[PDB]
Structure 1
Amino acid sequence: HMNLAVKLTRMEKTLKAYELYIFSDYENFENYVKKEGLKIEGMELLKEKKARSLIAEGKDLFETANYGEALVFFEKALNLSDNEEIKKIASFYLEECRKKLAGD
């Protein structure tokens, strides 16, 4: 259109996504990026950091015997990252949660 005007709007959008990351929470950031369909430099690393956070939360749930919620966090962590360590730790805890919730 005006190639200038378009690059400006995509810059503005990218800046808003980073502002949300910096000044609000991951959920706001992720929701903005998803519904605006943004390509964000370093998004993979940010996703891995969230996935490790999710493990951490899932662990404290696990260690307080909130096995049902813990499962949910580990599952989310597993599927958010492609980090092998994160996926391994998640999968390990997921199966422990499944054992705790089995009954059988």
Structure 2
Amino acid sequence: GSHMNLAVKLTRMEKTLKAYELYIFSDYENFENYVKKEGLKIEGMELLKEKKARSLIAEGKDLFETANYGEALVFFEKALNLSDNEEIKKIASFYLEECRKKLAGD
């Protein structure tokens, strides 16, 4: 040609580097906000969502353990909505039901 016409490719790649940098150097929320708004497909995203969902379950569990069932419920539902990972689903669903039991006075 000898034009390579790489600009579109490189600007996508720049954004995916920026996404990885947000994951490494910033909060999960900053990372996912950027990925969502730039519409990026990040390889291994599911693993990252699973890890964050697991962190949310842990937060809920600590709230559950202080009998803040209402607040705990919020975290389990968040975890459920964040990751479609099968273990996350089962564990979050378990704890969600435990909250519901306590909330019903059972």
TM-score under structure 1 length normalisation: 0.91
The 2-side partners of 1:70 and 1:39 are apart by 31
Identity, in percent, stands at 100
Larger of the two Rg values belongs to structure: 2
The SS at the match of 2:34 is helix
Listed as ranges, the gaps of 5+ residues in structure 1 are none
Deviations 1:55-74 (A, max 9, x none): 11111111111211110110
- What is the number of equivalent residue pairs in this alignment? 104
**Residue by residue, what CA displacement relative to the aligned partner does 1:47-97 show, whole Å, maximum 9, x if unpaired?**
111111111111111111121111011011112222222111111110111
Measured at CA, do residues 3 and 71 of structure 1 come closer, stay the same or move farther in structure 2, by a change above 3 Å? farther
Q: Which stretch of structure 1 is more off in the superposition, 71-80 or 24-33? A: 71-80
Note if contact 2:63-2:72 (Cα within 8 Å) is conserved in structure 1: yes
2:78 corresponds to which residue?
76
Question: Quick one: distance in 2 between partners of 1:3 and 1:39?
Answer: 22
Query: Is 2:46–2:85's contact at 8 Å kept on the other side of the alignment?
Result: no
List runs of 5+ in structure 2 lacking aligned partners: none
> Which range is displaced more, 81-90 or 54-63?
81-90
Q: Secondary structure at the match of 2:6?
A: helix
Say what the alpha-carbon RMSD is for the aligned residues. 1.8
> Structure 1 pair 96/9, CA: closer, same or farther in 2 (3 Å)?
same
